[PDB]
Amino acid sequence: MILVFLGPPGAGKGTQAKRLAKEKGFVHISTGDILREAVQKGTPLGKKAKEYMERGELVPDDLIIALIEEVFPKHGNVIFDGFPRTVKQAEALDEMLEKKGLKVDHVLLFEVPDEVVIERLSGRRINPETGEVYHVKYNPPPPGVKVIQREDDKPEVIKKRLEVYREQTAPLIEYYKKKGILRIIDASKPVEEVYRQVLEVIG
Ligand SMILES: Nc1ncnc2c1ncn2[C@@H]1O[C@H](COP(=O)(O)OP(=O)(O)O)[C@@H](O)[C@H]1O
Ligand SMILES: Nc1ncnc2c1ncn2[C@@H]1O[C@H](COP(=O)(O)OP(=O)(O)O)[C@@H](O)[C@H]1O
Ligand SMILES: [Co+2]
């Protein structure tokens, strides 16, 4: 089965997806994670993407659409996490799945207010050795463990990513609600609670 996790940055989409992949064996496709690997490796995608990312802008559709083609697994259930981000991306995803006799089964919309997303992101910390994600207030790193804060988690960039989310990504809500596959999630709640609600949604 094929899920899309949709919603603003910091809503908790990655936290839930990684949890789901791990416990239920979903294939977790994180375009954010994939892109950062590429940038850090200086691949051609990496080198081109870098500037858009640093600046809180969207990497161009064609690049991302091709990236998805590359990583989409022949078998397994799939969580799309951070893709699609635009209407053009969603149209292309539909056609790709189609050629494979597949489709998007559920779009989960992680609803959470602007106020909450700023607190989630500004406090997001990463363990660079394992890539485990933490938060200063809600799930603090173990003492003596070194962690970084991502550049795009800075206030100015956060502001721009929110803006980008509202302009380009938010119209996906109506796009999927149209298909009758959009389920709403209350992403404001604690992790365990948001998680139980994700499980109930997907049966
Ligand atoms: N589907 C996509 N289409 C275009 N660009 C993307 C996509 N996914 C990620 N990116 C780029 O990578 C950056 C980091 O993505 P992501 O980790 O999903 O952001 P967030 O901090 O909101 O989780 C995005 O701001 C964007 O520049
Ligand atoms: N339900 C929640 N309540 C409180 N904090 C959360 C919750 N879900 C995630 N977080 C924290 O908020 C930050 C954003 O989570 P993340 O999954 O990285 O966001 P997204 O993937 O939607 O961009 C992370 O630091 C994470 O540890
Ligand atoms: Co993420």
Side-chain angles (χ1 to χ4, degrees):
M1 81 160 322
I2 298 183
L3 318 164
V4 174
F5 289 8
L6 176 65
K13 304 185 299 301
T15 304
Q16 297 304 331
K18 289 183 270 271
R19 172 93 101 114
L20 201 64
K22 180 190 186 79
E23 304 183 1
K24 305 296 184 186
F26 277 83
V27 173
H28 178 195
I29 304 186
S30 176
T31 47
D33 286 351
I34 294 159
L35 289 170
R36 292 184 278 271
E37 250 261 22
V39 164
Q40 179 280 311
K41 287 190 312 175
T43 72
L45 172 61
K47 269 159 188 189
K48 186 80 189 189
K50 183 175 176 290
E51 60 219 334
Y52 303 88
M53 294 170 70
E54 287 182 312
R55 285 183 289 120
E57 278 156 3
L58 290 195
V59 182
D61 280 349
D62 286 8
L63 312 187
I64 292 328
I65 295 175
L67 177 57
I68 293 288
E69 279 172 43
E70 291 161 12
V71 295
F72 190 90
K74 186 172 188 56
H75 304 281
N77 297 321
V78 185
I79 303 168
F80 280 111
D81 172 21
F83 175 89
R85 281 309 240 289
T86 73
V87 169
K88 267 166 50 208
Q89 289 181 18
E91 279 168 348
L93 175 55
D94 285 331
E95 66 168 0
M96 182 190 82
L97 298 171
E98 179 193 333
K99 283 178 78 72
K100 297 181 193 288
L102 299 177
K103 67 188 197 307
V104 173
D105 294 287
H106 299 295
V107 182
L108 286 63
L109 169 56
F110 289 69
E111 300 206 320
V112 49
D114 303 282
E115 311 91 270
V116 183
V117 296
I118 295 180
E119 175 191 43
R120 299 255 177 95
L121 293 168
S122 84
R124 180 159 64 188
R125 296 304 183 263
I126 314 291
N127 185 331
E129 302 299 340
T130 63
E132 165 157 9
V133 171
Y134 297 94
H135 185 285
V136 298
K137 183 170 164 164
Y138 303 110
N139 175 29
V145 182
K146 227 271 179 184
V147 298
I148 69 144
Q149 175 179 235
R150 310 205 319 232
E151 289 308 310
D152 66 330
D153 286 345
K154 293 317 177 313
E156 321 82 12
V157 183
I158 290 181
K159 168 185 187 304
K160 169 80 167 175
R161 295 196 275 136
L162 252 311
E163 197 158 339
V164 157
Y165 169 80
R166 308 184 219 103
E167 183 69 13
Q168 306 182 247
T169 304
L172 278 171
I173 302 171
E174 198 54 33
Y175 177 92
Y176 284 121
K177 187 198 315 298
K178 277 198 211 162
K179 321 297 199 58
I181 61 175
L182 185 83
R183 332 288 168 212
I184 312 247
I185 296 292
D186 187 354
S188 312
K189 299 299 189 293
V191 164
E192 233 52 32
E193 165 165 9
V194 170
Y195 185 59
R196 280 196 303 271
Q197 188 186 0
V198 169
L199 296 180
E200 180 263 322
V201 163
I202 78 191

